[PDB]
Design a protein around this ligand. Structure first.
Ligand code: HEM
Length: 154
Protein backbone atom coordinates (compact mmCIF):
# COMPACT_ATOMS: atom_id res chain seq x y z
CA UNK A 1 0.00 0.00 0.00
CA UNK A 2 0.98 3.58 -0.47
CA UNK A 3 0.00 6.64 1.50
CA UNK A 4 -0.58 9.96 -0.14
CA UNK A 5 1.31 13.07 1.02
CA UNK A 6 -1.97 14.38 2.38
CA UNK A 7 -2.38 11.27 4.54
CA UNK A 8 1.23 11.51 5.76
CA UNK A 9 0.64 15.12 6.74
CA UNK A 10 -2.35 14.16 8.84
CA UNK A 11 -0.26 11.48 10.58
CA UNK A 12 2.67 13.75 11.14
CA UNK A 13 0.48 16.52 12.38
CA UNK A 14 -1.03 14.51 15.22
CA UNK A 15 2.34 12.88 15.91
CA UNK A 16 3.85 16.32 16.56
CA UNK A 17 1.34 16.66 19.42
CA UNK A 18 2.28 13.27 20.74
CA UNK A 19 5.93 14.46 20.75
CA UNK A 20 5.09 17.19 23.25
CA UNK A 21 4.84 14.41 25.85
CA UNK A 22 6.38 11.14 24.73
CA UNK A 23 6.55 9.58 28.15
CA UNK A 24 2.98 10.33 29.11
CA UNK A 25 1.67 9.00 25.86
CA UNK A 26 3.99 5.98 25.99
CA UNK A 27 2.52 5.14 29.38
CA UNK A 28 -1.11 5.61 28.31
CA UNK A 29 -0.71 3.38 25.24
CA UNK A 30 0.96 0.47 27.14
CA UNK A 31 -1.49 0.57 30.00
CA UNK A 32 -4.31 0.64 27.50
CA UNK A 33 -2.83 -2.42 25.77
CA UNK A 34 -2.29 -4.35 29.03
CA UNK A 35 -5.81 -3.60 30.17
CA UNK A 36 -7.63 -4.50 26.99
CA UNK A 37 -5.37 -7.57 26.20
CA UNK A 38 -3.81 -8.77 29.37
CA UNK A 39 -2.16 -11.67 27.53
CA UNK A 40 0.18 -9.10 25.97
CA UNK A 41 1.60 -8.40 29.40
CA UNK A 42 2.90 -11.97 29.63
CA UNK A 43 5.30 -11.09 26.82
CA UNK A 44 7.10 -8.74 29.17
CA UNK A 45 9.17 -10.71 31.70
CA UNK A 46 10.15 -7.32 33.00
CA UNK A 47 6.57 -6.19 33.78
CA UNK A 48 4.76 -9.50 34.23
CA UNK A 49 4.47 -8.87 37.98
CA UNK A 50 2.36 -5.66 37.69
CA UNK A 51 -1.12 -6.42 39.01
CA UNK A 52 -3.12 -3.20 38.81
CA UNK A 53 -3.26 -0.06 36.73
CA UNK A 54 -2.02 1.83 39.72
CA UNK A 55 1.16 -0.28 39.78
CA UNK A 56 1.55 0.16 36.10
CA UNK A 57 1.28 3.86 36.52
CA UNK A 58 3.93 3.86 39.21
CA UNK A 59 6.47 1.84 37.25
CA UNK A 60 9.44 3.90 36.03
CA UNK A 61 10.52 0.88 34.07
CA UNK A 62 7.25 0.69 32.20
CA UNK A 63 7.51 4.40 31.45
CA UNK A 64 11.03 3.91 30.11
CA UNK A 65 9.85 1.21 27.75
CA UNK A 66 6.94 3.23 26.47
CA UNK A 67 9.35 6.01 25.45
CA UNK A 68 11.46 3.52 23.52
CA UNK A 69 8.38 2.11 21.86
CA UNK A 70 7.07 5.51 20.74
CA UNK A 71 10.48 6.83 19.79
CA UNK A 72 11.05 3.95 17.45
CA UNK A 73 7.57 4.17 16.03
CA UNK A 74 7.98 7.90 15.55
CA UNK A 75 11.19 7.42 13.58
CA UNK A 76 9.45 4.99 11.27
CA UNK A 77 6.48 7.24 10.64
CA UNK A 78 8.75 10.19 9.82
CA UNK A 79 10.31 8.08 7.02
CA UNK A 80 6.95 8.25 5.21
CA UNK A 81 7.11 4.74 3.83
CA UNK A 82 10.83 4.50 3.25
CA UNK A 83 11.41 2.60 6.43
CA UNK A 84 13.27 -0.60 5.37
CA UNK A 85 16.40 0.14 7.39
CA UNK A 86 14.54 0.95 10.57
CA UNK A 87 12.35 -2.11 10.31
CA UNK A 88 15.09 -4.73 10.05
CA UNK A 89 16.43 -4.73 13.54
CA UNK A 90 12.97 -4.22 14.95
CA UNK A 91 11.62 -7.21 13.07
CA UNK A 92 14.62 -9.29 14.07
CA UNK A 93 14.22 -8.66 17.77
CA UNK A 94 10.47 -8.98 17.82
CA UNK A 95 10.41 -12.18 15.80
CA UNK A 96 13.43 -13.97 17.24
CA UNK A 97 14.02 -12.64 20.67
CA UNK A 98 10.67 -11.43 21.90
CA UNK A 99 8.35 -13.65 19.78
CA UNK A 100 5.60 -11.11 19.25
CA UNK A 101 2.77 -12.29 17.00
CA UNK A 102 1.37 -9.96 14.33
CA UNK A 103 -1.87 -10.18 16.26
CA UNK A 104 -0.33 -8.29 19.18
CA UNK A 105 0.92 -5.57 16.86
CA UNK A 106 -2.71 -5.31 15.95
CA UNK A 107 -3.72 -4.77 19.55
CA UNK A 108 -1.08 -2.05 20.11
CA UNK A 109 -2.27 -0.36 16.99
CA UNK A 110 -5.71 -0.26 18.45
CA UNK A 111 -4.42 1.18 21.68
CA UNK A 112 -2.53 3.90 19.86
CA UNK A 113 -5.62 4.98 17.98
CA UNK A 114 -7.63 4.92 21.18
CA UNK A 115 -5.23 7.14 23.04
CA UNK A 116 -4.82 9.66 20.19
CA UNK A 117 -8.52 9.77 19.92
CA UNK A 118 -8.93 10.58 23.62
CA UNK A 119 -6.14 13.12 23.94
CA UNK A 120 -6.25 14.90 20.54
CA UNK A 121 -9.91 15.05 19.43
CA UNK A 122 -9.35 18.23 17.46
CA UNK A 123 -6.45 16.76 15.47
CA UNK A 124 -7.91 13.28 15.30
CA UNK A 125 -11.14 13.44 13.38
CA UNK A 126 -12.25 10.72 10.92
CA UNK A 127 -9.82 11.62 8.16
CA UNK A 128 -6.79 11.77 10.46
CA UNK A 129 -7.82 8.55 12.09
CA UNK A 130 -8.09 6.86 8.74
CA UNK A 131 -4.67 8.14 7.75
CA UNK A 132 -3.18 6.84 11.05
CA UNK A 133 -4.81 3.47 10.55
CA UNK A 134 -3.31 3.19 7.05
CA UNK A 135 0.12 4.10 8.35
CA UNK A 136 -0.11 1.51 11.11
CA UNK A 137 -1.43 -0.98 8.58
CA UNK A 138 1.54 -0.37 6.25
CA UNK A 139 3.88 -0.84 9.24
CA UNK A 140 2.19 -4.13 10.11
CA UNK A 141 2.27 -5.45 6.58
CA UNK A 142 5.90 -4.68 6.08
CA UNK A 143 6.82 -6.14 9.45
CA UNK A 144 4.85 -9.30 8.66
CA UNK A 145 6.81 -9.75 5.42
CA UNK A 146 10.05 -9.40 7.36
CA UNK A 147 8.91 -11.94 9.90
CA UNK A 148 8.42 -14.43 7.04
CA UNK A 149 11.86 -13.77 5.65
CA UNK A 150 13.28 -14.25 9.08
CA UNK A 151 11.60 -17.62 9.56
CA UNK A 152 8.85 -16.57 11.95
CA UNK A 153 5.76 -15.41 10.03
CA UNK A 154 3.29 -15.79 12.88
C1 HEM B 1 4.44 -0.33 17.64
C2 HEM B 1 5.09 -1.49 17.68
C3 HEM B 1 6.31 -1.69 18.57
C4 HEM B 1 7.48 -1.07 18.48
C5 HEM B 1 7.80 0.10 17.53
C6 HEM B 1 8.35 -1.70 19.49
C7 HEM B 1 9.60 -1.29 19.87
C8 HEM B 1 10.39 -1.84 20.85
C9 HEM B 1 11.74 -1.34 21.06
C10 HEM B 1 12.39 -0.29 20.14
C11 HEM B 1 12.29 -2.03 22.07
C12 HEM B 1 13.81 -2.03 22.39
C13 HEM B 1 14.70 -2.76 21.35
C14 HEM B 1 14.17 -4.09 20.92
O1 HEM B 1 14.14 -5.02 21.75
O2 HEM B 1 13.70 -4.16 19.76
C15 HEM B 1 11.25 -3.00 22.46
C16 HEM B 1 11.33 -3.97 23.42
C17 HEM B 1 10.29 -4.83 23.69
N1 HEM B 1 9.12 -4.95 23.00
FE1 HEM B 1 8.47 -3.85 21.20
N2 HEM B 1 7.72 -2.78 20.03
C18 HEM B 1 6.41 -2.66 19.65
C19 HEM B 1 5.41 -3.53 20.01
C20 HEM B 1 5.56 -4.48 21.00
C21 HEM B 1 4.46 -5.32 21.44
C22 HEM B 1 3.05 -5.17 20.86
C23 HEM B 1 4.96 -6.16 22.38
C24 HEM B 1 4.30 -7.27 23.22
C25 HEM B 1 2.99 -7.34 23.40
C26 HEM B 1 6.39 -5.87 22.45
C27 HEM B 1 7.22 -6.45 23.36
C28 HEM B 1 8.48 -6.00 23.62
C29 HEM B 1 9.28 -6.59 24.67
C30 HEM B 1 8.80 -7.71 25.63
C31 HEM B 1 10.42 -5.90 24.65
C32 HEM B 1 11.62 -6.00 25.58
C33 HEM B 1 11.17 -5.38 26.91
C34 HEM B 1 12.22 -5.44 27.98
O3 HEM B 1 12.76 -6.50 28.39
O4 HEM B 1 12.56 -4.33 28.33
N3 HEM B 1 6.71 -4.75 21.70
N4 HEM B 1 10.10 -2.86 21.71
Amino acid sequence: MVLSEGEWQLVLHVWAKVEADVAGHGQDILIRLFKSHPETLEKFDRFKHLKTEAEMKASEDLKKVGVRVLTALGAILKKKGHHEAELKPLAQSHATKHKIPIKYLEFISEAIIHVLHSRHPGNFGADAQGAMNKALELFRKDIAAKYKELGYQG
